[PDB]
Design a binder for these strands. Structure first.
Ligand SMILES: [Zn+2]
Lengths: 101, 218, 132, 206, 24, 82, 71, 129
RNA sequence: CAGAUACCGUCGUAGUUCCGACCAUAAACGAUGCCGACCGGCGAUGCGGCGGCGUUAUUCCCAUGACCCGCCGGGCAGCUUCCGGGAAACCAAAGUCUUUGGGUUCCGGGGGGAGUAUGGUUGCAAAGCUGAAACUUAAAGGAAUUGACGGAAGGGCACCACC
RNA sequence: UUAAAGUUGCUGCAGUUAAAAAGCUCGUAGUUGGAUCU
């Protein structure tokens, strides 16, 4: 029986969507079906910042960041705990998780 | 000893309300069986249509419980149907009889052709629907009897209908839905608008408004 | 853990709602008023009711509780409720009214009101929340 | 008001409506509340027509007066802003108040403790007092409600267009209804103003 | 799986083409 | 509803909605019958008379029982013109 | 849906003819292969000569030997 | 495309009266529609109506009185002889005490009883009860 | 690895790319033919048009662009509803169906044998299209509900668990 | 062999998930076709 009204996708009013490769498997996934994450991290972690500024020759130097867009297939987002399963009604909640709090 | 708890029972028990059609006219929900026992009483007769065992799976085996279908009627234009599930059959039947009394509705009777005597058939073709079961009632000439299956025939005789053609579609082997689809069709006889009932309605005071002073002091 | 039970909590609530006048803040006096009135079995059950009574009377001084109802507290709250200032909040010398409300009052043949003062409406039509 | 000159609304009353912000609605409009508004003003606030508010209030007062037993009318408020105004409305006319949480099964379960069978129901908010108002569809109850511009009108038979959000507006709207009920019954003179002021009905933040 | 059985039934036909001919 | 002899052979005559002219059945528990009081032209007190309106559950589930009663009261003169 | 014109009789009749052959009772009766495979040839009874006595073991869950004859 | 404009006329009236409405708009108007509506009206089922001119196929506004259970069209216009009318009214009408079948005959558009009085058959347009 | 003709890894042929001819098949799916009418709301979005305070293209002339507030038409969708339907899941269409007829095309008739054999036809081939019967069988199947189990995810308790 | 069978469905069945809408569009025969005249 049918589970999702959108068939697990975002495809509406078009026939074909170009595929992409999963970051973890290298598996072909439609771009509208893949699980996408934008990660903006710091190059150095908080375990290394105190040892980096004390050696920096520039006063008030701001350390750079790192920008990566990651694509997952449905299997890796579940195995890596990126995406969980949830109840039938909760499945209809498409608000992003309250991380911004 | 009837100690009524609703204000309709306290008016039935005090001789203020002297007819069931007086309660039917205002669509008031009836919540006590002694009101039905008061007016119809010796006229009422009941019939057990089926006893259904049902089961609920548990860790330690099944859990059995019995369901009872009971029809009730006075053979003079009133009919009801009630269903009850309980751990014991006697309790199930005793509790289903109460529900059948509380479900009693009136039946409109009409004439197939010429209008001589008391009405004998349904006023018009009426359809009842219940979970894949369709039951159609067609008026029939006087003296034809009830041309129907044995399950809807009991409810059609309880209601005072003498002549009627019947048709049935869908899974009629489930008599729980087969009996609830013919009961639905009987209920619709006083819901179908006909040129007989085209006159403007005159509004009479409701019993709650009429016996305000009696209810206040009781 | 030291958590009371519905038996002791119900009995104490009933005692407080029925005998507010004699009960007080002292434990050893409430322990002696409970034995005089309520037919209670042994001391251990008597004390756990008379201790929660003493605990629960302090909360009443802080204000009402959602579990008991004293008619003396009803009277006190009615004295609080029967409060009206000498000058009401609805009699004002000047009432500020928008230009659009003034036309509605004009249609209501209330163009002779003297307490009114038409004000300048906001110009930027920005009353929506940004989307995203 | 059947176009009668004694039932027309006066300047001392329109000034009370204006001071309490009754004419001011919300940013949204229900499609069945559209006939009660005058116009939408920039900053996107709808204005309620006070003439229509007066007509609906008088109709509700008539409906209340037609009930012979004063206690058969039940008045309900869930939000605290209406809890002082329904205990004060019920003390002047004799109706039965319910302030606080409404227990499901009050009108349908016939063995409960606080079981009652009202003949008329008046609520402060259709959206907040939704359980008492849908439970009334099981036992043949008429309903009068105080409605804003975004209030649904299901099971609502007399909807009074008003600002049902502000404390001053709620207190004033409950005080006017009691005033009209008493003046229609004939216990209060229609020339002398009421010696009870609206402040007794208002909600105060502690 | 029906896909494999469809594949199996096709090899049988391809071989029966050879073993059942007009020249037989 | 009556035979050729003219006798009335109907068990009872049901009510009809004042709005949609629909028959109100015996198990329509969402139907209301409402009295609106009438006043004196001079003193404006309760005369002792009233006007009655019946509304059916289908109409008052639809959300149209507020406008229906207002229309019926305007028709009877209770509500002012506009 | 189905065509509903006044000049549709040929369409309706031809469609019914074609679709009756998907009824297995109709096809079995009207095709002729089930009449040639019937040993009795359309008769209700027939006479024959006994060749051997046989015993046929019953299908599960039953366990017995039904006693038949080859004719 | 739009074929049998009378079918659209009768489906619009049926759908509005299910919703408890007091007026219905019918477009386009046609004289078959007008005659059918008059036949319905003379029996007390709809009430007064009015035609709006557009220098085109006009339109109709019909007042509804809540007395209509069903009004429907029959397609195609089968020919009906006076000996085959009883079967049609058994199949289509809900009772022998009320309901009407509307036919078109050489004497006009009428119901199944006026046709019997005038001793004429015709073609079936529809029914209402 | 018990075994691996596999899953993992190192190479690697045809192929993957282009030009010119064949092939005509997909869970080619919204598993939902096309044309037309009627039937509830609400906020957005893409295009075209119409109207309206006010910001900005720096200080001005108008048009023109970027915002802001609405209206109309045609589109991709979304939320909500006792519109009504349905076995239900669910669907504003899958509604307007025993109160059964707007027009028209294709196609189904318990489960297998079987999309197989045979004949015809197209194709270089692989294959495509059309397409049985003998015989065998009392169920196969669709939705939803309580459990049991999961090498599925989250919580809690115990010195007959650990620390 | 007829009814039961509204399980051959003109009256009168079905085709999202139970059997089932052609991959898509064009196009002849066939079927159907908007107001409008006393
Ligand atoms: Zn992956």
């Amino acid at each position: 029986t049918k589970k999702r009204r959108n068939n697990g996708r975002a495809k509406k009013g078009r026939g074909h969507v170009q595929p992409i490769r999963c970051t973890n498997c290298a598996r072909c996934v439609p771009k509208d079906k893949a699980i996408k994450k934008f990660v903006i991290r710091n190059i150095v972690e908080a375990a290394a910042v105190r040892d980096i500024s004390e050696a920096s020759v520039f006063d008030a130097y701001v350390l750079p960041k790192l920008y990566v867009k990651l694509h997952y297939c449905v299997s890796c987002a579940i195995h890596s705990k990126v995406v969980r399963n949830r109840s039938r009604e909760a499945r209809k909640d498409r608000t992003p998780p309250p991380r911004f709090r | 000893e009837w100690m009524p708890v609703t204000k309709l029972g306290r008016l039935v028990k005090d001789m203020k309300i002297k007819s069931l059609e007086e309660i039917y006219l205002f669509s008031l929900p009836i919540k006590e069986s002694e009101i039905i026992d008061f007016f119809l009483g010796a006229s009422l007769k009941d019939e057990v249509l089926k006893i259904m065992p049902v089961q609920k799976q548990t860790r330690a085996g099944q859990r059995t419980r019995f369901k009872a279908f009971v029809a009730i009627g006075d053979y003079n234009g009133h009919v009801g149907l009630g269903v009850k599930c309980s751990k014991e059959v006697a309790t199930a039947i005793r509790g289903a009889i109460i529900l059948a009394k509380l479900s009693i509705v009136p039946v409109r009777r009409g004439y197939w052709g010429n209008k001589i005597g008391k009405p004998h058939t349904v006023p018009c073709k009426v359809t009842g629907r219940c979970g894949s079961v369709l039951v159609r009632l067609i008026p029939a000439p006087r003296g034809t009897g009830i041309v129907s299956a044995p399950v809807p025939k009991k409810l059609l005789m309880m209601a005072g209908i003498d002549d009627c053609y019947t048709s049935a579609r869908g899974c009629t082997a489930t008599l729980g839905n087969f009996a609830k689809a013919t009961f639905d069709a009987i209920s619709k006889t006083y819901s179908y608008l006909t040129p007989d009932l085209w006159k403007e309605t005159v509004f009479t005071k409701s019993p709650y408004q009429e016996f305000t002073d009696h209810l206040v002091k009781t | 853990g030291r958590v009371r039970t519905k038996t002791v909590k119900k009995a104490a609530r009933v005692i407080i709602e029925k005998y507010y006048t004699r009960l007080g803040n002292d434990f050893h006096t409430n322990k002696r008023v409970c034995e005089e009135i309520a037919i209670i079995p042994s001391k251990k059950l008597r004390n756990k009711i008379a201790g929660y009574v003493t605990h629960l009377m302090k909360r009443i001084q802080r204000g009402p509780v959602r579990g008991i109802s004293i008619k003396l507290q009803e009277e006190e709250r009615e004295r609080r409720d029967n409060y009206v200032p000498e000058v009401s909040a609805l009699d004002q010398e000047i009432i500020e009214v928008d230009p659009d409300t003034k036309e509605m009052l004009k249609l209501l043949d209330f163009g002779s009101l003297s307490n009114l003062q038409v004000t300048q409406p906001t110009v930027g039509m920005n009353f929506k929340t940004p989307r995203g | 008001s059947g176009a009668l000159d004694v039932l027309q609304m006066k300047e001392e009353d329109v000034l009370k409506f204006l001071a309490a912000g009754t004419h001011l609605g919300g940013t949204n409009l229900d499609f069945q509340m559209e006939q009660y508004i005058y116009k939408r003003k920039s900053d996107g606030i709808y204005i309620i027509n006070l003439k229509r508010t007066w007509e609906k209030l008088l109709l509700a007062a008539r409906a209340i007066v037609a009930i012979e037993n004063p206690a058969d009318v039940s008045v309900i408020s869930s939000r605290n802003t209406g809890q002082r105004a329904v205990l004060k409305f019920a003390a002047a006319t004799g109706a039965t108040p319910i302030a606080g949480r409404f227990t499901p099964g009050t009108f349908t379960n016939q063995i409960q403790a606080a079981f009652r069978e009202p003949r008329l129901l008046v609520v402060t908010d259709p959206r907040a007092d939704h359980q008492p108002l849908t439970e009334a569809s099981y036992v043949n109850l008429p309903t009068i409600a105080l409605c804003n511009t975004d209030s649904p009108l299901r099971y609502v038979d007399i909807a009074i267009p008003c600002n049902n959000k502000g404390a001053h507006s709620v207190g004033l709207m409950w005080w006017m209804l009691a005033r009209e009920v008493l003046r229609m019954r004939g216990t209060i003179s229609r020339e002398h103003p009421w010696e009870v002021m609206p402040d007794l009905y208002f909600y105060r933040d502690p | 799986r029906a896909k494999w059985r469809k594949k199996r039934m096709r090899r049988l036909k391809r071989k029966r083409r050879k073993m059942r001919q007009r020249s037989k | 509803m009556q035979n050729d002899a003219g006798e009335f052979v109907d068990l009872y005559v049901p009510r009809k909605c004042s709005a949609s002219n629909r028959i109100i059945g015996a198990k329509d528990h969402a139907s209301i019958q409402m009295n609106v009081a009438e006043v004196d032209k001079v003193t404006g007190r309760f005369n002792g008379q009233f006007k009655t309106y019946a509304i059916c559950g289908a109409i008052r589930r639809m959300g149209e029982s507020d406008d229906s009663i207002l229309r019926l009261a305007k028709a009877d003169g209770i509500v002012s013109k506009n | 849906g189905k065509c509903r014109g006044l000049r549709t009789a040929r369409k309706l009749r031809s469609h019914r003819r074609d679709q009756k052959w998907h009824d297995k009772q109709y096809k079995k009766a009207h095709l002729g292969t089930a009449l040639k495979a019937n040993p009795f040839g359309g008769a209700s009874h027939a006479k024959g000569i006994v060749l051997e006595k046989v015993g046929v073991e019953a299908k599960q869950p039953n366990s017995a030997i039904r006693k038949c004859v080859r004719v | 495309v739009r074929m049998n404009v009378l079918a659209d006329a009768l489906k619009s009236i049926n759908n509005a009266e299910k919703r408890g409405k007091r007026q219905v708009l019918i477009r386009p108007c046609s004289k078959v529609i007008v005659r059918f509506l008059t036949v319905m009206m003379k029996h007390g089922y709809i009430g007064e109506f009015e035609i709006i001119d557009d220098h085109r196929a006009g339109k109709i506004v019909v007042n509804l009185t809540g007395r209509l259970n069903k009004c429907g069209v029959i397609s195609p216009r089968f020919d009906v002889q006076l000996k085959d009318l009883e079967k049609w009214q058994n199949n289509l009408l809900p009772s022998r005490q009320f309901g009407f079948i509307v036919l078109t005959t050489s004497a006009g558009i009428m119901d199944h009883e006026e046709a019997r009085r005038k001793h004429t058959g015709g073609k079936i347009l529809g029914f209402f009860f």
